[PDB]
Amino acid sequence: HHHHHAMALTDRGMTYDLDPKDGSSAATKPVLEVTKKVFDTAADAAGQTVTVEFKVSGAEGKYATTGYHIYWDERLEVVATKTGAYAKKGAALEDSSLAKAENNGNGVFVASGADDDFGADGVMWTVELKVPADAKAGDVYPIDVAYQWDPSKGDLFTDNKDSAQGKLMQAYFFTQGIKSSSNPSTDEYLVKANATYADGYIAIKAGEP
Amino acid sequence: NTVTSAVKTQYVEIESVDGFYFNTEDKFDTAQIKKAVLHTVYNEGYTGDDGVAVVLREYESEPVDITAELTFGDATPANTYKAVENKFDYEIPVYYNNATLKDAEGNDATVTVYIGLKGDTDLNNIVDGRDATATLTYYAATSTDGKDATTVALSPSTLVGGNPESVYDDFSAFLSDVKVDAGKELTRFAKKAERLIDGRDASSILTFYTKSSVDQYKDMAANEPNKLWDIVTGDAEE
Ligand SMILES: [Ca+2]
Ligand SMILES: [Ca+2]
Ligand SMILES: [Ca+2]
Ligand SMILES: [Cl-]
Ligand SMILES: [Cl-]
Ligand SMILES: [Cl-]
């Protein structure tokens, strides 16, 4: 009955509304997993820099063009790469000669392109996030992968030709391959954080007490 | 009784070529007009006592070359552009002494232009990562032994339909060539084969897309894409 919001994160993800919207029949069904790091105590977690991976599976050699949004709990501090970027490409994008991370506040937009379907399974991107000094037992800092769209452009996960199968794969990616308000996480930590639209997190076990 | 001549009708014949434009441009190029000849038809006759007109003779005066006098009036790429699925061509009426002209068949004389969004390689009225990939893919293909601009199509658009010779592929190349080393000396009239569409064009298009997708540049991309292009190609800073 009551409405609940995350502590330091908003749900920017939008409803996937491109035809086809239902990716259940896609020949390729990509899933993106985001790190779920759990510390035992506040002392263990305070001031720690955590490597957060965004890892795709089910799509080896089946994609070429990607673009999606990542956001994180505002209390976390991103540790930029030597170039100032908030994210760094991983082995999954090794054969994609276009890859770009674009900073976006408590988040980053990450995109890739390839001259054929050279997208691979594995880590697409990593982001280093630092846990605040005043972290406390029970804290959860959610990390969200989100689909966004507007009349000018939208997020992408398709093949080199952007074929019918590419568009099916894309619908699947955004509607079933990531979590969102339409496909919520049931992860206890995300439920606690009131951020079931999010995908991963850095969490600290609750005390006893 | 009392013979006079009078202009009966006037028409123009125009030789013109296509012109490609970005939606942000404020001027069409009269260079599209190669030659324009004005024809004037006269009737010579009189009116009878019964008030009925009699034509004795029909003829034209010496045709006049008016090529250099033609303008496009107030029309510009920016005020003409409308995003329509699979439709990029427009007919722009010419003006002579501040008035339109009829062609030989009684229709307003017009010149064909194509107008699109810089970066929109696949001609879908959107600039995104798919355009960057298409541009990269073309570069990779044409850098392959045995392949060049004449054997490879750049645009995935159905308007091109894999046809390397399509005018729409020339237009796609115009839109995709966001990094032009030669600058303005390479005119809008260059054919796809006369351009360098490479990995630099592709990465610039990708960065435009990524920047358009974050809070800082969203409105810039939508409202004044030209300032964002300058940023992503290094022709401006910040
Ligand atoms: Ca999400
Ligand atoms: Ca496009
Ligand atoms: Ca170029
Ligand atoms: Cl298809
Ligand atoms: Cl699911
Ligand atoms: Cl110049």
Q: Across chain B, which distance is largest between two alpha carbons, in Å?
A: 84
Q: Enumerate long-range contacts of B158-165, CB under 8 Å, 24 or more apart.
A: B158/B86, B159/B86, B159/B88, B159/B123, B160/B123
Q: Could you give the CA distance from residue B13 to residue B28 in angstroms, rounded to a whole number?
A: 20
Give me the residue label for tokens 């790190």. Answer: A35
Residues B27 and B66 both lie in one domain: yes
Structure tokens at A6: 């995350």
- B58/B45 Cα distance (integer angstroms): 9
Q: How far is the C-alpha of A101 from the C-alpha of A89, rounded, in Å?
A: 8
CA angle B77/B79/B81 to nearest 5° reads: 60
Say if residue A20 is exposed, middle or buried (CB neighbours under 10 Å; 0-12, 13-18, 19+).
Answer: middle
Q: How many domains does chain B have?
A: 2
Method: X-ray
B213, A69: Cβ pair inside 8 Å?
A: yes
Chain B, residues 211-230, CB within 8 A of chain A, namely 211-216, 218, 221-222
* Measured CA angle at A61 (ends A55, A65), to 5 deg: 70
Closest by CA to A89, choosing from B206, B221, B214, is B206
Q: Domain of B58?
A: 1-117
Note whether B79 and B92 are same-domain residues: yes
Confirm or reject contact between B132 and chain A (CB < 8 A). Answer: yes
Coil/strand/helix, residue B131: helix
The CATH number of whichever domain residue A39 belongs to comes to 2.60.40.680
| Statement to judge: residues B88 and B34 lie in one domain | yes
Q: Note whether A98 contacts B202, CB cutoff 8 Å.
A: yes
**B215: which chain A residues are within 8 Å (Cβ-Cβ)?**
104-105
Task: Choose from B133, B223, B232 for mutation: most chain A CBs within 10 A.
Answer: B133
Q: Are residues B183 and B217 in the same domain?
A: yes
Give the resolution in Å: 2.0
CATH of the domain at B17: 2.60.40.3810
CATH code assigned at B207: 1.10.1330.10
Rounded Cα distance between A157 and A104, Å, is 20
Per the structure block, which two tokens stand in for B174?
């115009």
The CA distance from B2 to B45, in Å, is: 8
Q: Is A15 on the interface with B (CB under 8 A)?
A: no
Q: Are B156 and B122 in contact (CB under 8 A)?
A: yes
Q: Which CA distances in Å does B69 have to A190, B31, B37, B99?
A: 71, 12, 11, 11
User: Does the N-terminal peptide bond of residue A142 adopt cis geometry, omega within 30 degrees of 0?
Assistant: no
Question: Is the minimum CB–CB distance between A154 and chain B shorter than 8 Å?
Answer: yes
Check: CB of residue B132 under 8 Å from CB of residue B202: yes
Residues B45 and B113 in one domain: yes
Give the orientation angle of helix B199-212 with respect to helix B129-142, to 10 degrees: 170
One domain for residues B100 and B133: no
Q: Are residues B101 and B132 in the same domain?
A: no
> What span, in angstroms and rounded, lies between the C-alpha atoms of A94 and A98?
10
CA distance, residue B167 to nearest chain A CA (Å): 21
Question: Which positions ≥6 away from B199 have C-beta within 8 Å?
Answer: A97, B136, B139
Q: Cβ of A115 and B126 within 8 Å?
A: no
Count Cβ atoms within 10 A of the Cβ of residue B18 and give its class: 0-12 exposed, 13-18 middle, 19 or more buried: middle
CB distance B116 to B23 below 8 Å? yes
Residue at token pair 């010579």? B44
Residue B217 shares a structural domain with residue B138 = yes
